[PDB]
Ligand binder design. Structure first.
Ligand SMILES: NC(=O)c1ccc[n+]([C@@H]2O[C@H](COP(=O)([O-])OP(=O)(O)OC[C@H]3O[C@@H](n4cnc5c(N)ncnc54)[C@H](O)[C@@H]3O)[C@@H](O)[C@H]2O)c1
Ligand SMILES: NC(=O)c1ccc[n+]([C@@H]2O[C@H](COP(=O)([O-])OP(=O)(O)OC[C@H]3O[C@@H](n4cnc5c(N)ncnc54)[C@H](O)[C@@H]3O)[C@@H](O)[C@H]2O)c1
Lengths: 375, 382
């Protein structure tokens, strides 16, 4: 069997769904591994390094994908309506594994269905502990949370650590992390190791102890309300306006002293919760920066604009798109490993047969043999 | 007496030679403090903050400097030949304290002398222990070393720290610091703070223990080969050493992710530490931060003010690195100035008598009352 990995064509996408270390594992499993010439340039993974690991280099996308039984990629394939029909390059009946954005992108699923492709939408990986090594949302989020602090520190005109020199002492940066999920925890860790005084808040009560064990200060809003705020999947529930007002009052006290506010909150199937209103940014100190990591989902701050740095009220509101690609050389090997861990169990002693009864397979499959599975 | 601070006008300068805390001290010493409006915007220091500290706000640079007995600024004032005659705004007989670039800028010294201005070139602060609090080179350098690591991490496509995820582990970045002076020491500490593996090298033997104290690893070249001069300064070691230093460095440099070069030599172009040949051997995706770019660079591929991309490597050569940390750089530069001035103030007489026998005064004064003082600045007008 042949597995192919093309170059990512969507604008700004520097990640690639492969690594030399994953190529060797695939070859050891019996695959012919094909990668498009130059697919790993953005991730610092050369064609020679892939060849040395056992891969075959194809000169074009069409040539790489032409006979592939399994296609691995990072973002969903582009369709004819977008100007470049990447779906048409996938062999009819083949398997596709990638971040499909299935719930938000019906036409790509429909296009795949027409070619009878079996598509596993990696972002739908079931929230079960044995699937943590296969979860692309947490491996990429982890890097995004680190990146937020680096982007914050780059845009900030003071140093993060408190420095005590012969000339005098300069205070540390004060960082506030809104939403302490996977990205938020790495944001806290990164900011803390740099020397910042770190504060953080979240609706889930389980988060408090995680914040404190990293040396952050948790901002308590509604103690007992936090008790019922988590879902069974581990996500936050919609809280409401009464809490919204509460949250703001607790937060504002620290936000007026905050140098860097990092916002990462998401709500399953909903627009991002507004955590930093325009009124609130008005009370912030001149020179402060907001890193809105939820900008593509609506933003936790209404002033953030996707792919831009907006300046308003003396505050820089940073809203880069595709933050994981700003750490592409680390993001790629981890994304590649997520795909390898998901696929490996279905190879035996030597073919690949996806076990359809496996919960990670049925939970991720959005279309198969011309039929849409999870509408 | 009146002390005035104008807005910095050189291109890219965001620092300001003042802070609210320093204004308070100056007012406490009997000074009237005036700052040009908007002077601290780049450093996040508002006029209101300065007014609340006891300073007055002047509408223009000329209104700010016209009656000032003492003038503080960051970079050397511009002359008539540069488009804005800033020295013309300084009252005749006033005292100027700033980074003058005195030994490399004749025109400014001549202009100042012509108006009988007494100028203290802060960059010539004697390297004595009691003057450390007055030293603008080290306060500014320390922030530049921190900033090199932030700029490096910003330009690099991998995280600095080792990260242990459920998906697998990603190894830490490897950093190689060349030149372990004030800037190099801060680059080591900040790179270590971020969990990087840090290697470093310098011609001064004593640096080794400073590197190890921060958890970094020293690249030895020639243990035996008298390097530190009397001022705590290094040098021009010869071609022999240069070839030998390149050798051991290569082994680490071939696996390095971020190389931060900070080496300088008093009165000479910066030493070449990373040849083009050597950048050819680095991993694609690697980044070089050349903090010595303005003195000619430690890497010949660096160009002032640019990020050069060659051989898959980013060669970063921003100018005025301290200004990339202006909101911390400004308060420290202001304190350096305050620490140098304070001893000479006589509160009851409201006079400024710079003690001539004071080593900091004699080491820094380049012109006084219309007569050049620094021995290297004597000469004919242009
Ligand atoms: C792991 O990851 C699981 C989910 O984390 P994730 O990163 O995938 O989550 P996610 O990306 O869906 O959300 C990030 C964080 O935002 C928080 N959040 C949502 N609405 C919020 C609001 N109004 N105010 C403050 N915070 C808000 C969530 O509780 C979560 O911790 C958790 O169980 C953790 O144990
Ligand atoms: N900055 C000041 O004015 C000042 C004031 C007081 C004390 N000091 C002390 O003086 C020492 C020098 O520090 P600095 O920041 O001013 O140095 P610097 O800016 O002049 O040079 C940076 C470092 O580059 C090194 N270097 C020079 N040529 C080199 C080469 N070919 N290869 C490798 N490294 C090379 C130097 O030894 C120095 O340590 C330190 O101990 C500092 O604490 C400096």
């Amino acid at each position: 069997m042949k597995i192919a990995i093309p170059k990512e064509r969507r604008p700004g996408e520097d990640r690639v769904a492969i690594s030399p270390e994953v190529v060797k594992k695939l070859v050891g499993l019996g695959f012919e591994v094909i990668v498009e010439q130059g697919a790993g340039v953005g991730a610092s993974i050369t064609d020679d390094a892939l060849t040395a690991a056992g891969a075959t280099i194809a000169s074009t996308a069409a040539q790489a994908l032409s006979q592939a039984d399994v296609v691995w990629k990072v973002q969903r394939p582009m369709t004819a309506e977008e100007g470049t029909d990447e779906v048409a390059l996938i062999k009819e009946g083949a398997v596709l594994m990638c971040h499909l954005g299935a719930l938000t992108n019906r036409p790509v699923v429909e296009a795949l269905t027409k070619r009878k492709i079996t598509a596993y939408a990696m972002e739908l990986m079931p929230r079960i502990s044995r699937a943590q090594s296969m979860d692309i949302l947490s491996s990429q989020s982890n890097l995004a949370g680190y990146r937020a602090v680096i982007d914050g520190a780059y845009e900030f005109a003071r140093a993060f650590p408190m420095m005590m020199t012969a000339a005098g002492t300069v205070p540390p940066a004060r960082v506030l992390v809104f939403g302490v999920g996977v990205a938020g925890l790495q944001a806290i860790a990164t900011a803390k190791r740099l020397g910042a005084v770190v504060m953080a808040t979240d609706v889930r009560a389980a988060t408090k102890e995680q914040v404190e064990s990293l040396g952050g200060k948790f901002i308590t809003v509604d103690d007992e309300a936090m008790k019922t705020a988590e879902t069974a999947g581990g996500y936050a529930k919609e809280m409401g306006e009464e809490f919204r007002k509460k949250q703001a009052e607790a937060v504002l006290k620290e936000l007026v002293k905050t140098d860097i506010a990092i916002t990462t909150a998401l709500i399953p199937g909903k627009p991002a919760p507004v955590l930093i209103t325009e009124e609130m940014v008005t009370k912030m100190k001149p020179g402060s920066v907001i890193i809105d990591l939820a900008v593509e989902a609506g933003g936790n701050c209404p002033l953030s604009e996707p792919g831009k740095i907006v300046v308003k009220h003396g505050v820089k509101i940073v809203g880069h798109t595709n933050v994981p690609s700003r750490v592409a050389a680390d993001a790629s090997p981890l994304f590649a490993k997520n795909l390898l861990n998901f696929l490996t169990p279905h190879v035996d002693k030597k073919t690949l047969v996806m076990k359809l009864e496996d919960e990670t397979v049925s939970g991720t499959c959005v279309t198969r043999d011309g039929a849409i599975v999870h509408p």
